[PDB]
Design a protein around this ligand. Structure first.
Ligand SMILES: CCCCCCCCCCCC(=O)O
Ligand SMILES: [Ca+2]
Ligand SMILES: [Ca+2]
Ligand SMILES: [Ca+2]
Ligand SMILES: [Ca+2]
Lengths: 57, 236, 296, 236, 49, 57
């Protein structure tokens, strides 16, 4: 039936792979879901301003 | 209503009148450990206020020639306050920090200080000493700021929780960082989750006559402190 | 019954604040029509990086833009789509003559920081969880394909490491071994994320001993046992001499990748393995230099 | 939220941090020609972005003795950018302008510049030359600012789209003017709908030591540009 | 069929913005009663020509 | 699930191919639909006449 041991286990992304063996880690990397979050690194500020507004009030 | 601000933790309070807002490390607030992420079977100690408070430690003097300095959080605080004790008595440690690097001047001064956080801050040189890897209080100084003494370009450090102290605008920076490690807990006596770097990108300058004593102080505060594995008191 | 303080105290929140959500992004953002705008109070361009945020100013608020439908996919700029590419990370030498590897066997330490190409990419992040696929290219120093038989055996940390070309350890009753001829195609192997730590650590800012950390022991600063996967052994299946000069090259590809904290790229030339030590006597600029900032 | 401002036209953007707001000439925005006000039977050319953009042309130096300068819009822009071409290739012209005269200084400087618009700006002296009536780029200078070189009192110029650049408050002025003429269109090669005057009413002063180089730049941008009567290329 | 840019473009407005309307004015403005006033934030006199 | 990257993407013609990998371009050329338009090159004239009629009226 297969095992659940492929690092990206319980991963939020949905990977559609191909595997011939019992262990899921032997499976290919396959197609994945495309999600992003430029903010966690670009705008990790507590308060948000917006372009139209002046950064420092 | 964006420059003024106040930080209140434990029995300490910080003030500012030229702040440039607060940055949250990777957009995440310091949280405790889940009952599934932890493997340490024993209810840890969350002293809170007694350790989760503001600690003003070291201070340095900015000059027209200063290269830069750095610290190693996990270790830095140890040996001081109630926090240090738990860190020395317990084996496992866990906590996030609120850093506040203040440095004021007059409207006639000019300068730009980059204050960023760097996880797992390892250094090179063929092996640096214990006095260089864990310079707790009073930190250490950078010799080759361009490569951060690690062989990496500083021009690419903004890719981490950072902030600037441009004397012509603000006079202090503030960062908040959650616990960071491939583990739930870890002894801070021998491992530093990260380090703080303060480097002048724009050389401090000012016409003669204006008070040349421009100090830069460091004040931090633990958050969601959790300690486990209570044992004998250790130092390193 | 309650001191109230205990009721209020949020102490014990395993739930992280977040405040930032990951959204779908197959095609790059599509630009939209934008007309002129002349007004006070609105300063899209004016920012203050002194805060630590990347200017959120958009093209539209800068120039009278048109409308564009970005079909450009961002599927090749993903983790797997990037790291999942075979690369040289190991290289063993079992020559006939020499002092390097006589006897006919060789114990290689499991570490990939020995080669630039691969090491550069991986050291971009601080942590990384994943599985991998290793390929083994065995051949003589010329490219000569020889009818020789070998035995690759994995030796986990704490397991008996072979000491001779015929050490008992090669019975591999438990350890995983692979026998292949240099005539058959390279070895295909899948390796799961094995480590006490939830993710491999590229940089370890601390000591694994927890002792005095004397100068002679500064040889440990940076050494993380969570990256110690033991060793890899290889030898010819025989009691006599190999009869041939061999050289095995190990290639690796990553599957199911999970990177975390990102750090600055490498600026200097790597010197040691698992050591960020750099050429201090001669440091070079991150990039090319010019003659004047006012001349091209 | 009244001093800061941004102007975006074509592929140009202007900034300010001490603006004193925007004035609209006679309270009216630049509009195109109605199908009844026009007599030119032929669909004109509205290039838009290619001509309706910001153009930074001349710059002058303000001094403790400067008298004043002036320009003639219709003509000024010609010979420069895509706009100039349409003005030279076509016979009929029509457009409104957005003027932005910037001039900064420090909080230790003092001065007051009057920037007004004057429709059909004719000058006297017994007849001024072509180099004085149409000093396009780099404009011309006033010799008798009190009478605007036309015999009229400057003390009564505020009766037209104007604005002030008082160094102690703002550092730039901005005006918007719609097409003005007793006709729908008209060749700008030989007729200037109006002119811009910049005169220091409060002599620029400052104690020695502070950078004495106080430049005054002129930046304008066409609006609702319409050209008709396409023919051979002409210059004057 | 439309590049969108052509749809948005306001280019071709024969209608002037105005923003200022002419109103009746036979008699000059009539003055009204006014009592004292002492407060912050209100600066009628303070202007910026 | 596969990717959509095979040149003749969004192509009007319907190609029935065989592919074993994640990327659709690795697929065979396979059977396609037979469409033609001899006019775009033979009779790209604005106005049409017909055989029975005289080309130049
Ligand atoms: C079985 C393959 C596992 C691959 C793990 C390689 C990790 C090597 C990292 C070495 C870093 C170090 O030792 O400090
Ligand atoms: Ca000190
Ligand atoms: Ca220490
Ligand atoms: Ca000039
Ligand atoms: Ca001229």
């Amino acid at each position: 039936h297969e095992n659940s041991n492929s690092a990206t286990e319980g991963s939020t992304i949905n990977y559609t792979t191909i595997n011939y063996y019992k262990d899921s880690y032997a499976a290919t990397a396959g197609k994945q879901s495309l999600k992003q979050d430029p903010d966690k690194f670009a705008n990790p500020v507590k308060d948000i301003f917006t372009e139209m507004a002046a950064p420092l009030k | 209503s964006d420059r003024v601000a106040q930080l209140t933790i434990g029995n300490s309070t910080i003030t500012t009148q030229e702040a440039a807002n607060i940055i949250v490390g990777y957009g995440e607030w310091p949280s405790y450990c889940s009952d599934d992420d932890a493997t340490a079977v024993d209810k840890p100690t969350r002293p809170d206020v007694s350790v989760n408070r503001f600690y003003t430690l070291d201070t340095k003097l900015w000059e027209k020639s200063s290269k830069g300095w750095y610290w190693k959080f996990p270790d830095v605080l140890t040996e001081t306050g109630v926090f240090g004790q738990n860190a020395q008595f317990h084996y496992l440690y866990r906590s996030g920090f609120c850093i506040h690097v203040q440095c004021n001047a007059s409207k006639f001064h000019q300068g730009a200080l980059l204050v960023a956080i760097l996880p797992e801050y390892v250094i090179g040189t063929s092996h640096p000493p214990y006095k260089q890897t864990q310079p707790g209080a009073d930190g250490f100084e950078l010799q080759h700021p361009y490569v951060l003494d690690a062989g990496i370009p500083i021009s690419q450090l903004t890719v981490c929780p950072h902030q600037w102290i441009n004397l012509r605008t603000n006079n202090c920076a503030t960062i908040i960082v959650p616990y960071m490690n491939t583990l739930p807990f870890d002894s801070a006596l021998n491992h530093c989750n990260f380090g703080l770097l303060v480097v002048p990108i724009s050389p401090l300058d000012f016409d003669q006559g204006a008070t040349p004593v421009i100090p830069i102080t460091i004040t931090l505060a633990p958050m969601c402190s959790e300690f486990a594995g209570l044992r004998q008191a250790v130092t390193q | 019954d309650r001191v109230a303080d205990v009721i209020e105290s949020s102490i014990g929140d395993s739930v992280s604040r977040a405040l930032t959500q990951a959204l779908p992004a197959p095609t790059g953002q599509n630009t939209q029509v934008s007309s002129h705008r002349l007004d006070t109070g609105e300063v899209p361009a004016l920012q203050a990086a002194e805060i630590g945020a990347s200017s959120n100013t958009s093209d539209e608020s800068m120039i009278e833009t048109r409308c564009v439908l970005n079909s450009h996919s961002t599927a090749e700029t993903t983790l797997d789509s990037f790291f999942s590419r075979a690369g040289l990370v190991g290289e063993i030498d079992l020559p006939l003559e020499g002092t390097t590897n006589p006897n006919g066997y060789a114990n290689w330490d499991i570490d990939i920081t020995g080669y630039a190409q691969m090491r550069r990419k991986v050291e971009l992040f601080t942590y990384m969880r994943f599985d991998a696929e290793f390929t083994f290219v065995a051949c003589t120093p010329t490219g000569q394909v020889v009818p020789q038989l070998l035995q690759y055996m994995f030796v986990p940390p704490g397991a008996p490491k072979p000491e001779s070309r015929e050490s008992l350890a090669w019975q591999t009753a438990t350890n995983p071994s692979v026998f292949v001829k240099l005539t058959d195609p390279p070895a295909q192997v899948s390796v799961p994320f094995m480590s006490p730590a939830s993710a491999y650590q590229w940089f370890y800012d601390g000591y694994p001993t927890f002792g005095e950390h004397k100068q002679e022991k500064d040889l440990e600063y940076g050494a993380c046992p969570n990256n110690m996967m033991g060793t890899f052994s290889v030898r010819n299946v025989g009691s006599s001499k190999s009869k041939y000069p061999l050289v095995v090259r190990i290639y690796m590809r990553m599957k199911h990748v999970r990177a975390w904290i990102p750090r600055p790229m490498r600026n200097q030339n790597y010197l040691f393995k698992a050591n960020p030590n750099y050429a201090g006597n001669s440091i070079k600029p991150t990039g090319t230099s010019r003659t004047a900032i006012t001349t091209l």
